Amino acid sequence: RKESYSVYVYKVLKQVHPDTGISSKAMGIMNSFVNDIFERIAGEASRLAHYNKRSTITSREIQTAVRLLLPGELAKHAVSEGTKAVTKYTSS
Amino acid sequence: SRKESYSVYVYKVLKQVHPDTGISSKAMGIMNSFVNDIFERIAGEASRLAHYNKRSTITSREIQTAVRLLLPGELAKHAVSEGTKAVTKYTSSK
Amino acid sequence: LRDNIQGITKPAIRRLARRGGVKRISGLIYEETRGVLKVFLENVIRDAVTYTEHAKRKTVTAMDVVYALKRQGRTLYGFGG
Amino acid sequence: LRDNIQGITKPAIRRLARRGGVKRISGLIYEETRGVLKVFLENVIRDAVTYTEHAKRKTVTAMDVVYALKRQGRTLYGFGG
Amino acid sequence: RYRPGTVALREIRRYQKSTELLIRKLPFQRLVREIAQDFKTDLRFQSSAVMALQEASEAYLVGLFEDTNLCAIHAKRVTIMPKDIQLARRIRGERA
Amino acid sequence: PGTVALREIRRYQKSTELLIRKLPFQRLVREIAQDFKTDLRFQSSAVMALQEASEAYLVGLFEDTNLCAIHAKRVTIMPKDIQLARRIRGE
Amino acid sequence: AKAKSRSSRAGLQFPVGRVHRLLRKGNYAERVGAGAPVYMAAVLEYLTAEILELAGNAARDNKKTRIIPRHLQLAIRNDEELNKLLGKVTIAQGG
Amino acid sequence: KSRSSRAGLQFPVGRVHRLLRKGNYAERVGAGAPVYMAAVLEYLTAEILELAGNAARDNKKTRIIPRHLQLAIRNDEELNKLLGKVTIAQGG
DNA sequence: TGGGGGAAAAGACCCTGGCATGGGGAGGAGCTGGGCCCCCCCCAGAAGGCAGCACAAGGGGAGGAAAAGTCAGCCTTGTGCTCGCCTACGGCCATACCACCCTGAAAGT
DNA sequence: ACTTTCAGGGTGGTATGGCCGTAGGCGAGCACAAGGCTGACTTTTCCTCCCCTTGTGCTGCCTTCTGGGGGGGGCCCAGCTCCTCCCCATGCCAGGGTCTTTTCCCCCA
């Protein structure tokens, strides 16, 4: 019952490096990385909601939290990937 | 719209610790920021503690552990002693 | 909309250095301290403007600046918080 | 017991310095590095043991160490989180 | 005619005894608005916001100059240099 | 004197193994923890994580120390370099 | 019964009730215990008393009567523990 | 249909939604916030994995190891900025 | 000599008391995973010693580049006035999210 | 491979948040000095940089031995899990006590 992103990280490795495997130790580092960035974005989006006295974390707060934490080029691409998914999700 | 601050209580503690010394408005506004910063630090550390221990309650044990984690040395020692004394007085008087 | 980093004059940089305890100052210190100040200001102002844009505001506020400074481990007292 | 700081031997300190990029090492560097390592370990272990005692446990856990390091600005990837 | 250094020590004592801003306000306001221009056009600024920015900037610069003086004294010098500032920044973690 | 130093830097910068011996590091960690709580047990993973963190910390400190040493027109690192690096870092 | 303030019951001067309200509204946990506000208010009041006593000593050194940011900064920078606790904090008009 | 396969993401939108709701971040969590966070996490993991795979290929290896992850992180400038105060276990 | 802070008055708002109530965790058992301890061994690295060499430190010289003083100008700043724009509150209503019940599937074993 | 929890469909409800209106605080803008600050020049002198020498400590290499690393086994203690229940925290409403906003005037700066 101990969940992890080890199932979903594997499916993204088979899309960029289909012929390359991942060790057991390195795959646990991948989980500590995802669990770190998620808490970073959710800890800044929870501050933007408090500053503006809002009780809801929407995609607008996650967008700003990504913009405040990630560096220059990563934030330009991570935001674009986020808004493409939300648009596709809402549209059927 | 009425804003809230710890100015009244900071003034009461200042009167208790220094009977005749006053305080400027800039100093009071700095003290309010100090109190808010310490409060947010202890609250965040206690929330992280309760999440690490899979608990849904922030209690005196969590606040004491957060104080021990943040304050240095004799500051932490005396703050923990003051907190324990206050909690004992509160729960010893209904 | 013009060179405003030259408005951080040499006497101001020397005053800041002497507040820092510096005894003698090399003549190339000024143009480099100007760039350091520019980088720091760019970081803080970018964070403050991101907060302002998220808040759907047009004026950058002291509280936005305070949040921007706190986000860098540079908490500042006396302007709110 | 006592007298275990010497377990960080001089060759180990030289290997760590060579990993850092050091070419030549003075003789007092070994004692200074032992003191520095001792201070760092006391800080991290104090935080980890506080985290352990909060859980009413008697075993210092890799998670306790990870949290103690995280609350000092040194995140560690590999042992969980 | 005072000897080279005594006036410098007097300035050090005077500027460590005072609390005022050592950077003129109008040029700093102009520079702040200049920098914010490239982040968002037609941006207004609170005087308290500009005040907080100036206070933080001057505290940062004073601390950096103290570290620079430490670096200069390390190399057996009394004159701080751009190399001293660069070393201080690299060690604290601003230049990597 | 120095070519072996270069061919030691090139060897221990390319490898990833721990540089300190596990048994004395374990004994030192337990000796330190004894002053915080008596009769403490330690997970092997906890001690290993302490070792990795300590080694990374010391490698970074030695990088800053080497920078301080080159600042003073020297190739030999001295305790003054470590003290300056730590003071500038804020420790 | 008579509305006795929990601050008075605990013997503190800080607002135990307001601290409880901020802890509940701050999104720190699903629930907040009854001793958490009492402990946090006591800690905050002790730290305020310490910093204000040191600021008053600093003001008395300078032959003043009213505490100003300079006195607070002097107290913090001259106290070893308070310097460690606040060693990343900038004080406005503190010098 | 699973919420991930309505906008085309490999990361679990439902799991991220539950993590945000249970994470004590705000009294409410929107409906596009988990999608946006899942997209950002997926993009970051994909970028890090691609660079680590490039590093592993440079070392004539078919497996991702902490050494390769550390090499990718330290080589890429933006990743070096984001994970600048992060230690990788057995990463060299 | 001046200006702002310590006291006083009105009010408004939120804190406490009271009541009903679901659920979190404290506790009592059980169970077993691994942390500590002992044992053997052996050989890889730590330690000590010696040669030598190269590197840091002290002294001396030179030149060059900050410091200190001076003078003229300039542009910051405090005050005054205007405008109008943005921001904060109020009133209202839509719909987005939570809460809960069922079912199948996916991911962890 | 099997499966067991947990993500998803469906339905109700309301509380958060978006939209429109509005009015004022305050941010932008323009004069107007004027004088304190800044910029440019000059002397010089003291600091920094280069060179030379030396001795002192660092490094490289050999040899010995020791203690750390790798298993092998035990065991028993502490961490994890499950079932009870009860006591603590939450939700809601009334009413009053405390904390916020406005005026001032006299003592500290």
Author numbering:
A (entry chain H): 33 to 124
B (entry chain D): 32 to 125
C (entry chain F), D (entry chain B): 22 to 102
E (entry chain E): 40 to 135
F (entry chain A): 43 to 133
G (entry chain C): 12 to 106
H (entry chain G): 15 to 106
Authors' account:
pmcThe specific interaction of proteins with the nucleosome is central to the regulation of chromatin function and dynamics. The tardigrade damage suppressor (Dsup) and vertebrate high-mobility group N (HMGN) proteins bind specifically to nucleosomes via a conserved motif whose structure has not been experimentally determined. Here we used cryo-EM to show that both proteins bind to the nucleosome acidic patch via analogous arginine anchors with one molecule bound to each face of the nucleosome. In addition, to study nucleosome structure in the context of active chromatin, we analyzed nucleosomes that were reconstituted with a promoter-containing DNA sequence from a Xenopus borealis somatic 5S rDNA gene.
We first obtained three structures from a non-cross-linked sample of the 167 bp 5S rDNA nucleosome, which contains a 10 bp linker DNA on each end. The three 167 bp 5S rDNA nucleosome structures, which we refer to as closed, open I, and open II, lack density for the linker DNAs and differ in the interactions involving the core nucleosomal DNA. The closed 167 bp 5S rDNA nucleosome shows density for the entire 147 bp core DNA, which is wrapped around the histone octamer, and the open I and open II conformations show additional flexibility in one or both DNA ends, respectively. However, we did not observe a state analogous to open II, indicating that the flexibility of the core 5S rDNA increases in the presence of linker DNA. First, the downstream end lacks density in both the open I and open II 5S rDNA nucleosome conformations, whereas the upstream end exhibits high flexibility only in the open II state. Second, the lack of DNA density is greater at the downstream end (beyond superhelical location [SHL] +4.5 in open I and open II) relative to the upstream end (beyond SHL −6 in open II). Specifically, R77 of H2A near the DNA end upstream of the TSS inserts into the minor groove at SHL −5.5, contributing to the stabilization of the DNA around the histone octamer in the closed, open I, and open II conformations. In contrast, in the two open states of the 5S rDNA nucleosomes, R77 of H2A near the downstream DNA end adopts a conformation that is not compatible with a fully wrapped DNA turn.
